[PDB]
């Protein structure tokens, strides 16, 4: 099947001082956001109609409560332990926890913690594993959390029991949008001149779903190795934009075309020949 294969929740706890702390949460399906988190009410924002996906309102309320209690508890406990862990305000704590469905059937769960912009910890088989970037502080953190077995049991239960059946449920509940095929809108343009007597061949591709695409500058069947591909930049309404450039002379421009290969095109590719 096409589309996303992994569900995960992200956390961004910003600590300004020993009294101020702001947490930012959201649920994602690869690159597509399906949940929001209101830090004021301590509840979830279901962005899509199928965001609850086969889960009861009781279980959703149960899960929302666990996050609510954790978000406040963690922020408050970090402030109390900041002195011992030699923390310097301000700092940012990041977290990513979820599960992914791989080829063959296996659903593998994950949890990763971060301090600053670098890695801090990871949960491997319901145990705290400190990363080398975290140093002695991460070693001190994992040595402390291993003592609280119950917290690791909540982590284990949510990652290896709740997440796999939630992921499967939400992939079926939203297949109409996740497995959906959107035909890309492609057009050619001329960018800034890369030297006197030279042109910038720009090939724009926008509004395509799923994310896997193939764009190249062609002279018949020949693939031009000078094709400078951009980043898959996101759009609203769950679509993507990609720009492929090529530096060539004025005479070289004639006979060139832009080939676009996408899953929604059903074999017949978009070939845009250059016109002066």
């Amino acid at each position, epitope marked *: 099947f096409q589309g996303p294969t992994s569900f995960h929740v992200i956390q961004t706890s910003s600590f300004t001082n020993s009294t101020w702390a702001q947490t930012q949460g959201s649920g994602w399906l690869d690159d597509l956001q399906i949940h929001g988190w209101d830090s004021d009410s301590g509840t979830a924002i279901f962005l899509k109609p199928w965001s609850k996906g086969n889960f009861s309102d009781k279980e959703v309320a149960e899960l929302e409560e666990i996050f609510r*209690v954790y978000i406040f508890g963690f922020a408050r*406990e970090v402030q109390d332990f900041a002195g011992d862990f030699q923390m310097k305000y301000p700092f940012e704590i990041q977290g990513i926890a979820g599960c992914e469905l791989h080829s063959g059937g296996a659903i593998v769960s994950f949890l990763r913690g971060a301090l600053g912009g670098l890695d801090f910890l990871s949960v491997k088989n319901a145990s705290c594993v400190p990363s080398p970037e975290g140093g002695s502080r991460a070693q001190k953190f994992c040595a402390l959390i291993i003592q609280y077995q*119950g*917290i690791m*049991e*909540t982590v284990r*239960a949510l990652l290896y*029991e709740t997440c796999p059946r939630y992921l499967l449920g939400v992939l079926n509940a939203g297949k109409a949008d996740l497995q959906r095929q959107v035909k890309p809108e492609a057009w050619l343009s001329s960018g800034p001149s890369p030297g006197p007597g030279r042109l910038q061949l720009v090939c724009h591709v926008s509004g395509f779903y799923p994310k896997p695409v193939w764009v190249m500058w062609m002279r018949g069947e020949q693939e031009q190795q000078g094709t400078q591909l951009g980043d898959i930049l996101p759009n609203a309404n769950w679509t993507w934009y990609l720009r492929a450039t090529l530096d060539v002379a004025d005479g070289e421009a004639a006979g060139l075309s832009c080939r676009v290969k996408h899953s929604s095109l059903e074999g017949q590719d978009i070939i845009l020949y250059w016109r002066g």
Partner: T-cell receptor
Amino acid sequence: AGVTQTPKFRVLKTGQSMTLLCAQDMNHEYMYWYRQDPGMGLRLIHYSVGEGTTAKGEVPDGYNVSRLKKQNFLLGLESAAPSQTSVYFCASSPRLAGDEQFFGPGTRLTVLE
Amino acid sequence: GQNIDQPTEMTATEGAIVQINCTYQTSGFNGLFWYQQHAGEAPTFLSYNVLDGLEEKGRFSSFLSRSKGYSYLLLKELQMKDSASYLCAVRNTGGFKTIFGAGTRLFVKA
């Protein structure tokens, strides 16, 4: 005993109102209100995870709860019924490393017609 | 953990050994607890088991088996003060809510 319960015993008329006070001086974040009936056993009425918030347990009808201070969790009956004739126990545990619920002495309530 | 089964009553001779068995069914385990409750006082914390199996403290022992979904509470060299109700509890994921069993009334013969 580090958890206080007021009153110890109470007799009410069907329709009367009363308020049970649970006081704790351990600086515990989580507080609970239970009711014990012949096995059956302990049934959670309401619980508070913080000073502001409060949440429903197994049997939250028709009980009212309030948390204004981290040390006090108040249970309230607004219109007593003979069904609410039970032994009420309140308990508290910390947010971190607890693992142990500290129970109050208990309140024996009897609602008569 | 929500479904908890344990015996209603148990009678034992003073100075002997008693074993209160408890069988449970979880939809998410977070710990197994044992509580002592005298008539008609409040429940007292006795033991906490998060992993298999045995835990010791004084004359009391508590074993847990998450794989076989059961737990037992051992009462070594029994005394008269041990005559009370023994509650078997299972905590839900994660932390706050704890589900209590019906209890086991232990009668100690002098």
